Curated annotation (Swiss-Prot):
Species: Candida albicans (strain SC5314 / ATCC MYA-2876) (Yeast)
Result when mutating Q446A: Less than 5% of the catalytic activity of the wild-type
Notes on activation and inhibition: Inhibited weakly by methotrexate.
Annotated protein name in UniProt: 5-methyltetrahydropteroyltriglutamate--homocysteine methyltransferase
Entry EC number(s): 2.1.1.14
Binding site for 5-methyltetrahydropteroyltri-L-glutamate: K19, N121, D499, Y522, R525, Y526, W571
UniProt xrefs under SUPFAM superfamilies: UROD/MetE-like
Name of one Pfam family that matches: Meth_synt_2
């Protein structure tokens, strides 16, 4: 009776087939026909998987060779002129937009901007519009949503096409360089007819419903934008188009409820995983006949769903609007979860019992739907209940030492021993750095020997002492190089690290890792996030050995290098049974031990980077957001406040000055008015010349005092350019030292 629904399925393939074939295509190893054949294979496999699982509402158009939002831009002719000048077929225009284009003498067409999709770890290609943009359907390039619907239909699988809706599509885009005064939303009248035509075509092909995504409804929207949903949907809905299910996820639509209370659409979908508390209010506005899709299986995390609790949420929706009008759904697309738990070859059976990946989530929505339908699934419910009980009663989750340590967090634990003014004095006495001190921010070009030796070491073919000796040689090389250039504060190059999250996660209690838990991050770049399964602590030193060796071969101060607690949290799959805050503070305490060990070992300049802070900002202004900024900065300060005044804490940023200031780092490298009343120091970041450098500093000298300025590159190119560049930077910095 009650139907089940999936908002989208990850398209990468259980064996990363999509990556392999698209990268072969781009490198010229595979033909476009081979590319298209593999896409067809993947789509068919994924449709039949969903059909076999018993899912009622199965998506189409969720597939992509690169990005769904980019697919729409191609479909609607939101294609900037510069991409159209190379005689490229539409699929190659698509790829040109997504990943740029190089050509012989000399073309260097840059890809469109990559943008985080809300607070997920996915990135979309920014829709880019000009005054001259002529929205239209390009039939010769084929009409993807229509072709894919027909494709699935021919396999005996009826699907629901998924398209990003017109308000979100425009609102999430930006004005192109030539049209700086253009407001994207202003283009609504031009794009609606094109949506209308596409929907007509989908109807004619046999599509009876369409999932139309309007996730901007979970954002703070100006009143003027809110009015556009009525405008848009009155224009789209009619007898000649499929029924529309207006779909939201990742947040709370309540602030925008009036915007959608009088729409002619056939139904809505809401995310009751992220915001179950919005159920009553959103249900209350449903018109006669409109349906409510209850998102109760998480599309962004990997924990087995509690069937009893999820069913109860669905039952509340039923109580409000009727069993005939409720659908059991994934909370969002499954794009953000790995493909298949069954591919894992190493996880203990106890832990695996706690997880569900995309393939398993198909079974979950089906069982939940059957349960609320009155069908006997007592066996599935008992087994699920057993697994939930098992995880709950585990010990790998609960560490008494960690819990006790959490109670010790207080203001003093989150505060340096003295304010920056007093610290600076001790730091000057210890380091006596010159004005305009020079440093770098990250890694260097690693040799191929490093990868080969790492591989041999992992197989025992070389001994730890051999590998360690190769690592140190790489460190020695990097260090000597910097000394010759005359940099003031050095780094070791991190040759021993493969990733800035897993390198730490592997050395922390409370984490689990997958062999195949891949999730698409952007284009063909995938990530395999660590999973936080329980209370986190750090048994022993994680980075000290290599930093100590690096410092032992130079008299210049050597930077220790760490990733901060919030970034480790944001780039992992978090626990769902304890708050993000608590996990971050546990991480802060674990990292505090590492900072302390580095200091104790003589590494007294330490860089701790938090590149994921902005990405985890709660989607709306308010209590959740301000609390987040507070505990994110608190967790950083917990990691970094155990040190002496003479010990120097750095942090790099690629932002809200107020939050930066809240970290109280001694030095922060960034890529300024508010920083005028701020003591702590700042490092301001094609081949640059000494004079080209001299101009930049002179300008900034008009604002910030010379006494607060470090000199470094923008962020972490080849060896010849890295040499001259750095040599140019330092020679330049020295030139400003002469004037003092
Ligand atoms: Zn950067």
């Amino acid at each position: 009776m009650v139907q089940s629904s999936v908002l989208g399925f990850p398209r990468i393939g259980g064996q990363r087939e999509l990556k392999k074939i698209t990268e072969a295509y781009w490198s010229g190893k595979a033909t476009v026909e081979e590319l298209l054949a593999k896409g067809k294979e993947l789509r068919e496999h994924n449709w039949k998987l969903q059909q076999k699982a018993g899912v009622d509402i199965i998506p189409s158009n969720d597939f992509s060779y690169y990005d769904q939002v980019l697919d729409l831009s191609l479909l609607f002719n939101a294609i900037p002129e510069r991409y159209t000048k190379f005689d490229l077929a539409p699929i190659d225009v698509l790829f040109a937009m997504g990943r740029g284009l190089q050509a012989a003498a000399a073309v260097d067409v840059t890809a469109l901007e990559m943008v985080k999709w809300f607070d997920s770890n996915y990135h979309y290609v920014r829709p880019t519009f000009s005054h001259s943009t002529e929205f239209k359907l390009n039939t010769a390039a084929g009409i993807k949503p229509v072709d894919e619907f027909n494709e699935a239909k021919a396999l005996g699988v009826q699907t629901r096409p998924v398209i990003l809706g017109p308000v979100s599509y425009l609102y999430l885009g930006k004005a192109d360089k030539d049209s700086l005064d253009l407001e994207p939303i202003s283009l609504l009248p031009k794009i609606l007819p094109v949506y209308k035509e596409l929907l007509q075509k989908l109807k004619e092909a046999g599509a009876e419903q369409v999932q139309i995504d309007e996730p901007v409804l979970v954002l703070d929207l100006p009143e003027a934008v809110q009015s556009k949903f009525k405008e848009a949907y009155d224009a789209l809905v009619g007898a000649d188009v499929p029924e529309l299910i207006l779909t939201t996820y990742f947040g709370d639509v309540r602030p925008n409820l009036k915007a959608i209370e009088n729409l002619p659409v056939a139904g809505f979908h809401f995310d009751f995983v992220r915001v179950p508390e919005q159920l009553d209010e959103v249900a209350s506005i449903l018109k006669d006949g409109q349906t409510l899709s209850a998102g109760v299986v998480d599309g962004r995390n990997i924990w087995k769903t509690d069937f009893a609790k999820a069913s109860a949420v669905v039952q509340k929706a039923i109580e409000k609007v009727g069993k005939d009008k409720v659908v059991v759904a994934t909370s969002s697309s499954l794009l953000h979860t790995p493909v298949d738990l069954e591919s894992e070859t190493k996880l203990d059976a106890v832990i695996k019992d706690w997880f569900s990946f995309a393939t398993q989530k198909l079974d979950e929505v089906v069982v939940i739907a059957k349960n609320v339908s009155g069908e006997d699934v007592s066996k599935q419910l008992e087994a699920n209940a057993a697994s939930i009980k098992a995880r709950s009663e585990s010990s790998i989750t609960n560490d008494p030492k960690v819990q006790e340590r959490l109670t010790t967090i207080n203001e003093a634990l989150a505060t340096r021993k003295a304010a920056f003014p007093e610290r600076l004095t001790e730091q000057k006495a210890k380091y006596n750095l010159p004005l305009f001190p020079t440093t770098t921010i990250g890694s260097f070009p690693q040799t191929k020997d490093i990868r080969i030796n790492r591989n041999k070491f992992a197989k025992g073919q070389i001994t730890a002492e051999e590998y360690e000796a190769f690592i140190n040689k790489e460190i020695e090389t990097v260090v000597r190089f910097q000394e010759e250039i005359g940099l003031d504060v050095l780094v070791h190059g991190e040759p021993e690290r493969n990733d800035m999250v897993q390198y730490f996660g592997e050395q922390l209690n409370g984490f689990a890792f997958t062999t195949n838990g891949w999730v698409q991050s952007y284009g063909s770049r995938y990530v395999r996030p660590p999973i936080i399964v329980g209370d986190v602590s750090r048994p022993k030193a994680m980075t000290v050995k290599e930093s100590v060796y690096a410092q032992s071969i130079t008299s210049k101060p050597m930077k220790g290098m760490l990733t901060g607690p919030v970034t480790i949290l944001r780039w992992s799959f978090p626990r769902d049974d304890v708050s993000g805050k608590i996990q971050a503070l546990q991480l802060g305490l674990a990292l505090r031990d590492e900072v302390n060990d580095l200091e104790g070992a003589g590494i007294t300049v330490i860089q701790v980077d938090e590149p994921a802070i902005r990405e985890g900002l709660p989607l709306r202004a308010g209590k959740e957001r301000s609390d987040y900024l507070n505990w994110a900065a608190q967790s950083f300060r917990v990691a970094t406040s155990g040190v002496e005044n003479s010990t120097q804490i750095h942090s790099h940023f690629c932002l809200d000055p107020n939050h930066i200031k809240a970290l109280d780092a001694d030095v922060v490298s960034i890529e300024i008015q508010e920083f005028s009343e701020y003591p702590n120091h700042i490092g301001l970041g094609r081949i640059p010349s000494k004079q080209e450098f001299v101009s930049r500093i002179e300008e900034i000298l008009k604002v910030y005092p010379a006494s607060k300025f470090w000199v470094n590159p923008d962020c972490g190119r080849g060896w010849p350019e890295v040499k001259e560049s750095l040599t140019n930077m330092v020679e330049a910095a020295k030139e400003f030292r002469a004037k003092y």
